[PDB]
Amino acid sequence: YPQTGTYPDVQTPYQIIKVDGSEKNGQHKALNPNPYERVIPEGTLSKRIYQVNNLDDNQYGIELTVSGKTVYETEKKSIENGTITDPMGELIDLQLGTDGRFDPADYTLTANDGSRLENGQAVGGPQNDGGLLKNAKVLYDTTEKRIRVTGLYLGTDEKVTLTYNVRLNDEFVSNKFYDTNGRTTLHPKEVEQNTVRDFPIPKIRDV
Ligand code: NI
Numbered sequence: 001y002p003q004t005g006t007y008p009d010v011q012t013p014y015q016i017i018k019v020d021g022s023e024k025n026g027q028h029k030a031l032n033p034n035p036y037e038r039v040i041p042e043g044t045l046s047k048r049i050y051q052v053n054n055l056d057d058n059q060y061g062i063e064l065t066v067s068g069k070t071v072y073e074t075e076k077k078s079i080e081n082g083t084i085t086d087p088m089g090e091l092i093d094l095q096l097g098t099d100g101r102f103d104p105a106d107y108t109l110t111a112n113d114g115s116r117l118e119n120g121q122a123v124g125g126p127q128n129d130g131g132l133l134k135n136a137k138v139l140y141d142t143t144e145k146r147i148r149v150t151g152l153y154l155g156t157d158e159k160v161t162l163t164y165n166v167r168l169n170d171e172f173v174s175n176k177f178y179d180t181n182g183r184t185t186l187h188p189k190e191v192e193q194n195t196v197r198d199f200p201i202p203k204i205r206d207v
Contacts, residue, residue, distance in 0.1 A: 001031065002177055007038075007198045009185075014038075014200045021052040025207070029055065031177065033200035040197045042078035042188040043068040043154065047199040049180065050163065058168035058206050059095075064199060065161045066186060068154030075155070081135075081190035082152040084162070087182030088145040089201075091172055095165040102140035102147070107164040109138055109149065112157070132158055146182075168204055177203040 004013040019030035036048035043066065050063035064086065069078035088094050097103045110116040115124040115131030117138065125131015135151035149162060166180060184199040 001028075002203065005033065005179075005201055005203075007200065008183060009196060009198045016200075016203065019049050019052070019202070022055060024055060027207070029058070029205055029207075030060065031203045033202065036200060037065075038197075038200060040186075040188075042186075042197070043156075044159075045186055045197060045199055047181070047184060047201065049202045049204070053165060058172075058204060059165060060167075060180070060204060061163055061165050062180060062202070063161065063163050064184075065159060066152065066154065067159035068156065068188075070155035077153055077155040077158075079152050079154040079186075079188045081150075082154070082186060082188045083190075084147075084149040084152070084184075084186055086147040086149075086184045086199075088147075088166065089179040089181050091169040091178050092180055093167045093169050094140070094145065094147070095167060096142075100142065102138075102142075102164075107138060107147075107162065109133065109136065109160065109162050111161070112159040132160060136160070138162070168206055172206055174207055175205060177205045179203050 015034045016031040017034040018028040022028045022030035032048045037046040046065040049060045051061040053059040104119045111132040113125045113131040115133045122130025122133040139148045180202045186197045
C-alpha cells in the first residue's frame, strides 16, 4: 500500500488508510486520507470515499465538503464566488445518465442551512430562496471528464456537501492503486485568482 499522498499546493504529505467495507481476500481495495478533512486559511475542506456501492465491481461513492469563515473589516466571507474543480482520475469513470450526461439525478449538492439543488434549481434555506446554494451550479464536460462547482459563498459554519459515484475502468492494471481524482482544488475567492487549495485524494484498486 502507498502510505501517503502529497498536497501539491504546499508540498506536505497526508496519510492514507483502509476504507471500511473494502476488504477482499485479506487485502483492502480502497484508501482514504486520514484525516479526510483539511483546515485551510479560509475554512475547512474534505474529500473521501464515503461508501462502497459494489466492491467486486469497484463502485464507490465520493463526497466533498467545504465550509468557510466570517471576517469583520462589514461582514465578509472567506469563500466568495469560490469554485471547486474536480477532474476524474485516470481510469476513473463518473457514473452518468442513460443519456451519457451528468444530470441532477447523478449527484447531490446540499448545504447545512437546509438548501439543495433540485433538478438544477436551488431550493430551501431559511428564506426558501435557495439559501447558501442560490448561485451555485454543478458543471461537467464529457470530454475533459471534470466536475466544477461554481458560485460558493460561505462564512463561518456555512457548509456545502457534494456527492457522486464512480467506477474503476476495466483497463485497470492488477494491484495498482489509482487516484479517484486528478488534482482537486478550491479557489476560495474570485478576487484572488491565484489562490488555490488542494483537497486530498482517495485511491482504489482491483485484483
Ligand atoms: Ni429531487
